[PDB]
Structure 1
């Protein structure tokens, strides 16, 4: 099949789950194989924060120091002296994959164990958050720590973004941040036709893990939930975004 050929071409393992929410048609390929989730966890983490915080709670300014700063903080590194509101942290986390912003939000919801418990409550029995950034990326093959599957990540994203896990105004906030993501241009966005709206969160991890989860909107019809996960056999492997764009093109074709 086309996914097998992509795996061969890019020398990577692919994990795909797509659901057309209008028809219950799926496209699956290793949908239950585990991958380090990497920064895709940022979307589910804001999902849980929105469950717990009122809109006005998000105006709370969070202070942090240079000590809180980790390996990839494009926004938070620029606001040490001044702090950032929870709303600004959510924005940075989702649109820029700001790791410090993720860590600060994670603290607000009680850390990885609380995130896990909130995901279990919504019926996600698979996603296994244990760590903060960037050490949640330290995943070796065979391990389940800080991994999920294409099916579980898509379903949990669907839960927060499309279902009653959040009320409409919070669902819309989440979606708007994700629609306005800056990091996903070469991934699912590059694999959908013109006029399809995309709300995605990317991940990049060890073993050339390269992930993108999204809600995608055909010009006309119900949203499609999509998780495209990938990983490679060498720890220091580089990813190619094109794999995810091409897998998306196969998904779009099959639907």
Structure 2
């Protein structure tokens, strides 16, 4: 069967490359799933920005904050990999702009400003617990959280826990309609990840994804696949302990995408 075939291929892929690979796939159409190390801990890196944006959107839904509120921040607050917030330091950015920069561009300062709005990393963890995720924990801000030391439980999630969060946020009732659509838009618009899961999917399919990258050869890609025919598919892919280049790591994630696409295609064909 297709799920067993996919799990077999993931075992071979992981061994060929000497990595630790964590994958959860859940197809809403057939209700089938497959996984590899899906309950093990993996460093989140930038994938936390999906939850941070969800938490801020949920506050806006309640009137606990406003997406139009302008946030001002200082030159000393700008951390590495901040392509949107860096150039806009003198002018400030609204909460909506920061959500968009964090998700679509993986802007690290934007992620940190969202965290500050939530009260810090503990606010992110508390939000995750409210979604029914008992595993994810954020302990540090960017870029300290990208250390990704093996054996360190700080700043980790599990592939299965993050797939559960994707379902709640994009397909369930965690957010109101307009907020759910905005988050989906930002994920679809991200051109980070063009050589990761996207590279293994058929060209007629679509993917809204949030990437991450960190120390110890950590490279992640999570999101929702919209196949040519049928219902959305949740995918959560975490790779770490790679001794190879980023290009080679991206190719491993592209092969995860091919494996997932073939299983979904078989589920669509019966």
TM value normalised by structure 1: 0.95
Aligned to 1:181: 190
Aligned to 1:118: 127
Whether 2:24 is the aligned partner of 1:17: answer: yes
- 1:192 Cα shift? 1.1
CA distance in 2, matches of 1:156, 1:43: 9
- Aligned residue for 1:214, secondary structure, equals strand
CA distance in 1, matches of 2:72, 2:9: 49
Aligned to 2:4: none
- 1:221 Cα shift? 1.1
Whether 2:11 is the aligned partner of 1:4: answer: yes
- Aligned residue for 2:22, secondary structure, equals strand
Aligned to 1:166: 175
CA distance in 2, matches of 1:89, 1:108: 11
- 1:179 Cα shift? 0.3
Aligned to 2:267: none
Whether 2:50 is the aligned partner of 1:40: answer: no
Whether 2:155 is the aligned partner of 1:142: answer: no
1:27–1:254 contact (8 Å) kept in structure 2: no
2:56–2:114 contact (8 Å) kept in structure 1: yes
User: Where does 1:77-226 land on structure 2 (aligned, <5 Å)?
Assistant: 77-226=86-235
- Write out per-residue CA displacement over residues 6-25 of structure 1, whole angstroms, 9 at most, x where no aligned residue: 11332211111000012220
Cα RMSD (Å): 1.5
2:47–2:210 contact (8 Å) kept in structure 1: yes
TM value normalised by structure 2: 0.90
- Aligned residue for 1:78, secondary structure, equals coil
CA distance in 1, matches of 2:217, 2:167: 26
- Aligned residue for 2:76, secondary structure, equals coil
Give the ranges of 4+ consecutive aligned residues of structure 1 lying more than 2 Å apart after TM superposition: 8-11
Aligned to 2:256: 247
CA distance in 1, matches of 2:54, 2:253: 24
The number of equivalent residue pairs is 253
- Aligned residue for 1:76, secondary structure, equals coil
CA distance in 2, matches of 1:233, 1:202: 16
- 1:108 Cα shift? 1.0
2:216–2:240 contact (8 Å) kept in structure 1: yes
- 1:190 Cα shift? 1.0
- Aligned residue for 2:237, secondary structure, equals strand
CA distance in 2, matches of 1:37, 1:217: 23
CA distance in 2, matches of 1:168, 1:147: 29
